[PDB]
CSV table of C-alpha atoms and ligand atoms in Angstrom, one decimal:
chain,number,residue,atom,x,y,z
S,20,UNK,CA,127.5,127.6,155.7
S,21,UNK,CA,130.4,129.2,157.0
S,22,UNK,CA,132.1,125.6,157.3
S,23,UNK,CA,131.1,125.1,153.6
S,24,UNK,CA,133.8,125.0,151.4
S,25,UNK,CA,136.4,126.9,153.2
S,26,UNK,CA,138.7,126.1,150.5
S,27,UNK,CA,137.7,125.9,146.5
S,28,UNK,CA,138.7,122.8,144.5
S,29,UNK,CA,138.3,123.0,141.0
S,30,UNK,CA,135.0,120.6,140.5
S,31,UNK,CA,133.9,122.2,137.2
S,32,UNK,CA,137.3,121.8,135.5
S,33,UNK,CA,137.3,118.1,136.3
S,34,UNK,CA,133.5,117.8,135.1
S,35,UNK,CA,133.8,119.6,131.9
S,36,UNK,CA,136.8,117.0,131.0
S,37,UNK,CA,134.1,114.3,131.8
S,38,UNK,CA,131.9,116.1,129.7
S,39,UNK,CA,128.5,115.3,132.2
S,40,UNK,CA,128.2,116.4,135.7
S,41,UNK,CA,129.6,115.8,139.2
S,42,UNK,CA,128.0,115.9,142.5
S,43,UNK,CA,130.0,115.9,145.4
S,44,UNK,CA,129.0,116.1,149.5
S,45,UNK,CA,132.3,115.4,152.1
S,46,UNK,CA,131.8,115.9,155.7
S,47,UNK,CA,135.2,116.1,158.6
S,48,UNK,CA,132.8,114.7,161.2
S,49,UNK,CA,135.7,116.0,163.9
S,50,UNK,CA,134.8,119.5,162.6
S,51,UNK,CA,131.9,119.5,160.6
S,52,UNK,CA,133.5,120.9,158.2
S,53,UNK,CA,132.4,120.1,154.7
S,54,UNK,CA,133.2,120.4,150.7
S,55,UNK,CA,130.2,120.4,148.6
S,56,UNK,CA,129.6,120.6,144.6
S,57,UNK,CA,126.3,120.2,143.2
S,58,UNK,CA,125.6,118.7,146.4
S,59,UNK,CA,121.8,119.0,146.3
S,60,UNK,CA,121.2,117.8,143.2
S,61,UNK,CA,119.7,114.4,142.1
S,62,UNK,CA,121.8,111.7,140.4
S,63,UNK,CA,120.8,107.7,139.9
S,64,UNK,CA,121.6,105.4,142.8
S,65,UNK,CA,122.4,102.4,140.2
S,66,UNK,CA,123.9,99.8,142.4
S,67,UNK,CA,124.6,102.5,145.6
S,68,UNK,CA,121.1,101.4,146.8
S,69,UNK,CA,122.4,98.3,148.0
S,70,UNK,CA,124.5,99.6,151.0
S,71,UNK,CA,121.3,100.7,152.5
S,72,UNK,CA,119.4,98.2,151.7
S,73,UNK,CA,121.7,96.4,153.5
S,74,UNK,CA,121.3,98.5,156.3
S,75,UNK,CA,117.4,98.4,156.4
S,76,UNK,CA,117.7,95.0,156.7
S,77,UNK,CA,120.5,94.9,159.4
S,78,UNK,CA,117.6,97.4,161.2
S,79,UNK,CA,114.9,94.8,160.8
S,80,UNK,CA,117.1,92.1,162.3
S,81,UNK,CA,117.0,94.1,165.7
S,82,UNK,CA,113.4,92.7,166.4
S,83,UNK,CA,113.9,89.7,164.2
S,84,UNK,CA,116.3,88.1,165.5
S,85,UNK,CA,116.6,85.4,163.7
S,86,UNK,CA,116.4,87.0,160.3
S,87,UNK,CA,119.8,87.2,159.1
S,88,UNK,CA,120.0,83.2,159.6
S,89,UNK,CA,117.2,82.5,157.7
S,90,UNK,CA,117.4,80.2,154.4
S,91,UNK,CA,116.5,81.5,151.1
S,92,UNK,CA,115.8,79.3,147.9
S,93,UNK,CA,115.4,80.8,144.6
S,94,UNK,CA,114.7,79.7,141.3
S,95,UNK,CA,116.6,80.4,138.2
S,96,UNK,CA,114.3,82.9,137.2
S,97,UNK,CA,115.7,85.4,140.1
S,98,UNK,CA,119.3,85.1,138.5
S,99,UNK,CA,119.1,88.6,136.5
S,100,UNK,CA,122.2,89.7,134.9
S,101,UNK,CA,125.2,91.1,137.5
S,102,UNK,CA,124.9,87.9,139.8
S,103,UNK,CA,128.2,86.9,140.4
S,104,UNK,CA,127.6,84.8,144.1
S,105,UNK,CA,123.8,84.2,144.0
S,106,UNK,CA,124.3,82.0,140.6
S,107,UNK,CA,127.1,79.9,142.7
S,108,UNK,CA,124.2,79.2,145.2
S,109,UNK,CA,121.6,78.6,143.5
S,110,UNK,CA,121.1,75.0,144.0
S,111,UNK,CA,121.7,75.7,147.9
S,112,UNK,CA,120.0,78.8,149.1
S,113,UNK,CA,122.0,81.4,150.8
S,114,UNK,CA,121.1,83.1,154.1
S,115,UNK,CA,119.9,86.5,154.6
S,116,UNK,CA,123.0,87.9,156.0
S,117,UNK,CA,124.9,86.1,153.2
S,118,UNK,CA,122.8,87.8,150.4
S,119,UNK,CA,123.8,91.4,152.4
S,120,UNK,CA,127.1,90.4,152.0
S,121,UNK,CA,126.7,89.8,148.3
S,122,UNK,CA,124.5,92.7,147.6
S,123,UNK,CA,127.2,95.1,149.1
S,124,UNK,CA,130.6,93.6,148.3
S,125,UNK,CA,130.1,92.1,144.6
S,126,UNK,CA,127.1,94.4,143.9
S,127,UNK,CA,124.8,91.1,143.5
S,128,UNK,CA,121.2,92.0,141.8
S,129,UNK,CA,119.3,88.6,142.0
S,130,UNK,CA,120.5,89.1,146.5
S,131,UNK,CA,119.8,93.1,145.8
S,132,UNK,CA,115.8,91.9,144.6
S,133,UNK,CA,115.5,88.9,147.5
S,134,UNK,CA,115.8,91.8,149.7
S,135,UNK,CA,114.2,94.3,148.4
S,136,UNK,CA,111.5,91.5,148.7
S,137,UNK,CA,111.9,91.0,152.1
S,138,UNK,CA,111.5,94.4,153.5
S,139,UNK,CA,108.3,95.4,150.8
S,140,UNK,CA,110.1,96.7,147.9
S,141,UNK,CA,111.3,99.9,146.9
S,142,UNK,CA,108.6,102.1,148.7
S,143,UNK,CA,109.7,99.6,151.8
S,144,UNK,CA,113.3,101.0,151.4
S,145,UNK,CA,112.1,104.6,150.6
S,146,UNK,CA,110.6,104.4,154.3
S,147,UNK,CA,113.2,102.9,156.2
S,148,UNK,CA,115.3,105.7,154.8
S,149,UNK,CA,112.8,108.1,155.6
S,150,UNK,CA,112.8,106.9,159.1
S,151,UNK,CA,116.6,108.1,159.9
S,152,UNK,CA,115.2,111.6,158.7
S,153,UNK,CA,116.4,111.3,154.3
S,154,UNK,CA,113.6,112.9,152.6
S,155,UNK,CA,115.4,113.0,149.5
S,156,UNK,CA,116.2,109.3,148.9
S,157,UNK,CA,113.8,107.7,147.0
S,158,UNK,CA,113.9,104.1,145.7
S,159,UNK,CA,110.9,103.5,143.0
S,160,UNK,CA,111.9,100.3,140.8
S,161,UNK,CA,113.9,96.7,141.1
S,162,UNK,CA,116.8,95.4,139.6
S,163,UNK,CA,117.5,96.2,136.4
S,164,UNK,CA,115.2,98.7,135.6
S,165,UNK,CA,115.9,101.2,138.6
S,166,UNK,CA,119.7,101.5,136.2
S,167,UNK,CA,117.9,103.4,133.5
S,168,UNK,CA,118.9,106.9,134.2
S,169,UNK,CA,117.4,109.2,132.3
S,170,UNK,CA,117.8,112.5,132.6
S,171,UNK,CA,115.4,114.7,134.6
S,172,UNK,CA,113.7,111.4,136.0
S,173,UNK,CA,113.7,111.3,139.9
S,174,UNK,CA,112.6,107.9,140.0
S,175,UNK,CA,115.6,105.8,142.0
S,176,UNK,CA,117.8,108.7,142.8
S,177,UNK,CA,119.1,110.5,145.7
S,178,UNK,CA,121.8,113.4,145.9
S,179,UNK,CA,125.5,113.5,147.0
S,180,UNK,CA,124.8,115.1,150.4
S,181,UNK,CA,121.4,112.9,151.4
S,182,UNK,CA,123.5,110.1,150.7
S,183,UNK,CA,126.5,111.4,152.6
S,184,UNK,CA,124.2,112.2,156.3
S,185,UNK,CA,122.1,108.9,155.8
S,186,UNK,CA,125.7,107.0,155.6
S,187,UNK,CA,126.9,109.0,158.2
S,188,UNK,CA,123.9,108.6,160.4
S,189,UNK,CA,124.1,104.6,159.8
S,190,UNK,CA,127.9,104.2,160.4
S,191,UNK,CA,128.8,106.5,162.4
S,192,UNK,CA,125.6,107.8,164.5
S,193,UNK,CA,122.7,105.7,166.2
S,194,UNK,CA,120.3,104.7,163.4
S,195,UNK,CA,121.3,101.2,163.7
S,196,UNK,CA,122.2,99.5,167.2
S,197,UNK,CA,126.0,99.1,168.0
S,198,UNK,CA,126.2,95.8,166.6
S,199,UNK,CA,124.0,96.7,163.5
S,200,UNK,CA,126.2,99.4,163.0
S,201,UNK,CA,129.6,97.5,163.0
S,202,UNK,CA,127.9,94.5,160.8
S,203,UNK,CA,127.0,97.7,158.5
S,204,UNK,CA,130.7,99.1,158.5
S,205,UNK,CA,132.2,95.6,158.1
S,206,UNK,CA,130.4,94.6,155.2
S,207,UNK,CA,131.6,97.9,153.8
S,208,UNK,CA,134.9,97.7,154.6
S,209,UNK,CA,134.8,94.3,152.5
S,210,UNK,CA,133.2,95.7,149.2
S,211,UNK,CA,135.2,94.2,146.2
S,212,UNK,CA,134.5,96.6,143.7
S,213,UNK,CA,135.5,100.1,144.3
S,214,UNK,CA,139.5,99.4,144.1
S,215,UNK,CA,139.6,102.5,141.4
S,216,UNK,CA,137.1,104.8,142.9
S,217,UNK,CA,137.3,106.5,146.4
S,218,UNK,CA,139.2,104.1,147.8
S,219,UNK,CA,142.2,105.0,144.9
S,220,UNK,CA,141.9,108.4,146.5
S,221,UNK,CA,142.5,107.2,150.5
S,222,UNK,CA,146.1,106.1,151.4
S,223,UNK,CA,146.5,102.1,152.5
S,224,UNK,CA,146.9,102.4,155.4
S,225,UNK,CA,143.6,104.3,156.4
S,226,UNK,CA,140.4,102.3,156.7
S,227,UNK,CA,137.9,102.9,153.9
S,228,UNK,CA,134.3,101.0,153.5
S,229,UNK,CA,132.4,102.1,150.3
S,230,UNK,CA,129.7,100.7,148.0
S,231,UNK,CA,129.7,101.8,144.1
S,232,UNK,CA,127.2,102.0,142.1
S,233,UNK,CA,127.2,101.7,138.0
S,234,UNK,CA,124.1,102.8,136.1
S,235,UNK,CA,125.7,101.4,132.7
S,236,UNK,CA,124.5,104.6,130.1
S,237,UNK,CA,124.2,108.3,130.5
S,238,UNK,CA,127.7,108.4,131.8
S,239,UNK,CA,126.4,107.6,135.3
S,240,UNK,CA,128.2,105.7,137.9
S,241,UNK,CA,129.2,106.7,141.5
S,242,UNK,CA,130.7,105.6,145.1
S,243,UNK,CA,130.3,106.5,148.5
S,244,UNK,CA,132.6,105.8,151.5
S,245,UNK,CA,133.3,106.0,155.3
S,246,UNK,CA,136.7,106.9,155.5
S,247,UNK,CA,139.2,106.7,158.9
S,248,UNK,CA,142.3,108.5,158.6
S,249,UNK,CA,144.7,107.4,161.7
S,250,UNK,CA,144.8,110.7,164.2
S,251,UNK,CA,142.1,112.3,163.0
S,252,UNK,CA,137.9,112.2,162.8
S,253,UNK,CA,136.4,110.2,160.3
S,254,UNK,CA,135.1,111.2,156.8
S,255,UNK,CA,132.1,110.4,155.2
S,256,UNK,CA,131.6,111.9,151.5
S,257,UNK,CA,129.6,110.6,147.8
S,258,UNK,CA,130.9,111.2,144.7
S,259,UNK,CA,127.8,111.2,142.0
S,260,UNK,CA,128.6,111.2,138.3
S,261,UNK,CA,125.9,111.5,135.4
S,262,UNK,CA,126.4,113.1,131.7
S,263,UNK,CA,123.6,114.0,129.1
S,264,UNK,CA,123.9,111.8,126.5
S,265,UNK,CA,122.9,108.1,126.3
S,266,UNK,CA,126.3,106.5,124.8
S,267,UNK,CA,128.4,109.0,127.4
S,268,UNK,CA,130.9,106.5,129.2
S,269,UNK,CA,131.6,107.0,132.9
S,270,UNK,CA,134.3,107.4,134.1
S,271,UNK,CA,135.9,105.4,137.3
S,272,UNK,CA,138.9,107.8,137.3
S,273,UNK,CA,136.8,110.8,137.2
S,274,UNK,CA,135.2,109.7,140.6
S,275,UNK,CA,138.8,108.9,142.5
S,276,UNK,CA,140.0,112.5,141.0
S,277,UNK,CA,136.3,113.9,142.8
S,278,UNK,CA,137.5,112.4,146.0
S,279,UNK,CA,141.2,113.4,146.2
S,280,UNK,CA,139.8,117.2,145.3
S,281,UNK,CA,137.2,116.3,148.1
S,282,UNK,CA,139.6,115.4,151.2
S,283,UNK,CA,142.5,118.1,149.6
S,284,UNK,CA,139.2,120.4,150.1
S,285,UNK,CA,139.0,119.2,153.5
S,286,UNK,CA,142.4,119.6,154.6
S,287,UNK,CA,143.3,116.3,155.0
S,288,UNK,CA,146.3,115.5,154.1
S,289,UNK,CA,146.3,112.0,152.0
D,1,NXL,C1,125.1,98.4,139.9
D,1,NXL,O1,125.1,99.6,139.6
D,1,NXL,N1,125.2,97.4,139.0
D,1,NXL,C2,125.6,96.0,139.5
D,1,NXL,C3,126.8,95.5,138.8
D,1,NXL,N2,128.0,96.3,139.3
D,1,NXL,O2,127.8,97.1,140.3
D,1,NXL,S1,128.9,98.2,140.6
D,1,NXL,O3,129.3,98.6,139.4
D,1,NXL,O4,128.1,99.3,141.3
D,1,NXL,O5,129.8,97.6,141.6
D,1,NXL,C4,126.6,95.6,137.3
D,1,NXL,C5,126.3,97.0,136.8
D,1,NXL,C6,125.1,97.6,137.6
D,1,NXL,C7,123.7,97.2,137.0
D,1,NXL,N3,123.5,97.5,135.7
D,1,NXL,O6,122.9,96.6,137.8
């Protein structure tokens, strides 16, 4: 605690402008040093469950080594909606690294359920996360109905700060073996959708890997990130977003103005 926001940012102004809720967890990992605002509360994962899925498979392929090779097929019936590189492959089959790539760096849902498949489904997730020590995370449906959002429901939700230490743990730490771990980073550092969250927040020339996630109602959308400044320890924060009513837009902008209070709270300078 005593590390715990050393320095106030004004989270609740920036929220009440949204009009929902924002749920913040940043950590200096030089320091330890952190910023946190509604950190401990649930939001929806929508799409943000796909970096670690990503990562419980990258963990499976230590003692399967020839898993991420391996040749998937798939019918037309596993192109759901939000399937921007599996529908170019469908008469071909992609590889199991290739989907991993998709699911993380163009948010792919048909590659997000092939996995999800491989590893036993959402309780299959919901243990390999348990397994690096998040009690919190929990993954309970498949693509698209895991979006759904509504709130007070815990089903396919985690909070800021789980979210934060389980990224940290994978990216940073030893959950994954040093390979694992930069395949996990890489794939990251290559997402294609968060140009106008986090990453709008951390200056060009610092490394940044994130993944986003966009529920699509109840204002709810997110984005979490690794982020290397040059000269200094790596950051890891989350930035959830949810809001009470069904029609309530989310906000990308909201989320990037989250993460510059976030690093400003941190002393970084950016
Ligand atoms: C994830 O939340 N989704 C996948 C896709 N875009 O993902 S992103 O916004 O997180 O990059 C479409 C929206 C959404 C979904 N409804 O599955």
């Amino acid at each position: 605690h005593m590390l715990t926001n050393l320095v106030a940012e004004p989270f609740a102004k920036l929220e009440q402008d949204f009009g929902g809720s924002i749920g913040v967890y940043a950590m200096d990992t030089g320091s330890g040093a952190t910023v946190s605002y509604r950190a401990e509360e649930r939001f929806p994962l929508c799409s943000s469950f796909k970096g670690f899925l990503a990562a419980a498979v990258l963990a499976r392929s230590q003692q399967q080594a020839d898993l991420l090779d391996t040749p998937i097929r798939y019918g037309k019936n596993a192109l759901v909606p939000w399937s921007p590189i599996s529908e170019k492959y469908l008469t071909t089959g992609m590889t199991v690294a290739e989907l991993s790539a998709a699911a993380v760096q163009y948010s792919d849902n048909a590659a997000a359920n092939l996995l999800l498949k491989e590893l036993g489904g959402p309780a299959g997730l919901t243990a390999f996360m348990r397994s690096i020590g998040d009690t919190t995370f929990r993954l309970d449906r498949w693509e698209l109905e895991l979006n759904s959002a509504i709130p007070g429901d815990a089903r396919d939700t985690s909070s800021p700060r789980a979210v934060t230490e389980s990224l940290q743990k994978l990216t940073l730490g030893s959950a994954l073996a040093a390979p694992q771990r930069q395949q996990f980073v890489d794939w990251l550092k290559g997402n294609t959708t968060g140009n106008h969250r986090i990453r709008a927040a951390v200056p060009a020339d610092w490394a940044v890997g994130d993944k986003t996630g966009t529920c699509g109602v109840y204002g709810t959308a997110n984005d979490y990130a690794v982020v290397w400044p040059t000269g200094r320890a790596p950051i890891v924060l989350a930035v959830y977003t949810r809001a009470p009513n069904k029609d309530d837009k989310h906000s990308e902008a909201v989320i990037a103005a989250a993460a510059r209070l976030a690093l400003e709270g941190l002393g970084v300078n950016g």
